Amino acid sequence: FKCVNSLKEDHNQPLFGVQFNWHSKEGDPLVFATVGSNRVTLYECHSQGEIRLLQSYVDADADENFYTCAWTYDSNTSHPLLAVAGSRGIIRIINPITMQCIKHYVGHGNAINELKFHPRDPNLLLSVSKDHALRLWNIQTDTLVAIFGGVEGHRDEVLSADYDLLGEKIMSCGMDHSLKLWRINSKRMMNAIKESYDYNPNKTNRPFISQKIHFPDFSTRDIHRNYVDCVRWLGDLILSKSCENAIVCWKPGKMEDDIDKIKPSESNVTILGRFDYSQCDIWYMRFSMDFWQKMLALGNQVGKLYVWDLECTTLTHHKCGAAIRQTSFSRDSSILIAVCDDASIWRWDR
Numbered sequence: 001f002k003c004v005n006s007l008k009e010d011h012n013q014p015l016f017g018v019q020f021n022w023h024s025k026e027g028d029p030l031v032f033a034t035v036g037s038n039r040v041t042l043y044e045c046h047s048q049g050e051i052r053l054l055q056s057y058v059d060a061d062a063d064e065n066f067y068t069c070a071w072t073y074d075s076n077t078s079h080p081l082l083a084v085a086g087s088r089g090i091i092r093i094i095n096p097i098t099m100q101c102i103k104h105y106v107g108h109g110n111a112i113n114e115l116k117f118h119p120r121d122p123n124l125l126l127s128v129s130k131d132h133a134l135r136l137w138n139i140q141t142d143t144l145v146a147i148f149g150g151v152e153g154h155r156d157e158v159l160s161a162d163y164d165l166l167g168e169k170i171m172s173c174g175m176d177h178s179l180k181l182w183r184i185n186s187k188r189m190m191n192a193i194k195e196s197y198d199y200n201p202n203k204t205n206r207p208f209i210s211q212k213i214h215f216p217d218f219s220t221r222d223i224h225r226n227y228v229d230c231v232r233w234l235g236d237l238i239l240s241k242s243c244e245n246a247i248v249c250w251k252p253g254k255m256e257d258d259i260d261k262i263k264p265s266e267s268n269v270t271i272l273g274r275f276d277y278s279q280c281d282i283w284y285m286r287f288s289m290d291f292w293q294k295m296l297a298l299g300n301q302v303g304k305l306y307v308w309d310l311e312c313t314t315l316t317h318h319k320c321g322a323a324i325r326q327t328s329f330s331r332d333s334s335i336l337i338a339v340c341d342d343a344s345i346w347r348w349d350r
């Protein structure tokens, strides 16, 4: 990778999220979203390293802080949609063409730390909150499918979550140091999803009744010793990090144990590998994989970008000194975008 461009956003506030749109066809505009302060900004990637500003959403609340964003598409028209959330704990669905707010979801009792769309169902949106729970929403019928948390759920703020390849299971992590598994391919969850598609408040006077899931399908506190702020599936394996200068590759149970055979009482974990680095000992720093899960990227607190080939390389620029909070690869992995604490955006091309 070579650094081809850089720009600064006028708000001069930290940028906490960056996401390229992976739902666009080949030869169509290369677009990414950045989130920081009360703003959501769209950019187009052109030839010769040109970054063109498309649109900006400025929230009506000046005190709102966006912490996360996720792309989806309307199942009926295949048109892109963008979900954003932060400190207010309100989910907002944006139309990227008009950059106007379509609908909004209220429910979480505190800030939203991450949003993730289901890999097979574009209508299924997952949120992770400071209130200690995870929520599953159906954005087509505007229903809360389930709440993941309670008695045997997270005991402190949830910082990250990820669906597996097919969206049969979720792995969540947080300030309680634990990594918790939640199966969504159970009869209870499959039926709750099916029923959320049959709901309409116009044909009934009774509300939709969400599943209150109190118990996870696996739980460990043996991987990290501080806040677990990023988690991602890599096949049946897990990649997770704390603020202890390492990304750990692990799996529940023993070496030969199948993930779908793991019982909720499983006391063992297997460490498979460790991705070691420096100067990334602060809270709230994400790692990211490309679409094909062939590349891994992580920014550090002094502006350096680490890139590993999963099949280390350091990327540095003398004008890049601020913490890189998140990174995003373009669908084809030809471009890598980095966002910083000083409101700066950095473009690296292969």
Ligand SMILES: CS(=O)(=O)c1ccc(-c2cnc(NCc3cccc4c3CCO4)n3cnnc23)cc1
Pocket: 014, 016, 017, 067, 068, 111, 112, 113, 114, 159, 160, 229, 230, 283, 284, 285, 286, 325, 326, 341
């Ligand atoms: C520069 S400063 O003023 O000291 C500062 C720094 C960080 C935050 C902050 C950021 N992000 C989140 N949540 C999303 C999140 C969660 C896990 C990993 C992760 C992210 C975003 C990147 O990596 N926050 C929740 N409460 N505070 C925050 C606020 C102020």
